[PDB]
Amino acid sequence: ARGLHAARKMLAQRRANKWADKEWKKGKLVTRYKCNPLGTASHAKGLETKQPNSGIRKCVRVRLLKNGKKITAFVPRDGSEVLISGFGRRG
């Protein structure tokens, strides 16, 4: 629709098509409060690589105080209650 009086559809059309947006939908439906281990928070106090790279990544498993779920966390540096704050990529 393009006519001057068809403002109902295009407003309605856009609302439907927004749900296809992966980034936009993730921030509106209820998973940031039940599926995100961090919830909406920044940090969280708590208690082998892919094919072409060889070695061992030292890691840690942590149980969160609030939720209680267990997550795997990396150790920062070489030879390196715990505060955990994500990675470069969001989620």
Binding site: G3, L4, H5, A6, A7, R8, M10, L11
Partner: peptide, 13 residues
């Protein structure tokens, strides 16, 4: 009547 909607510059019945 009509209700002008800003974003689309159009009205709706």
């Amino acid at each position: 009547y009509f209700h002008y909607v800003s974003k689309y510059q159009r009205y709706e019945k």
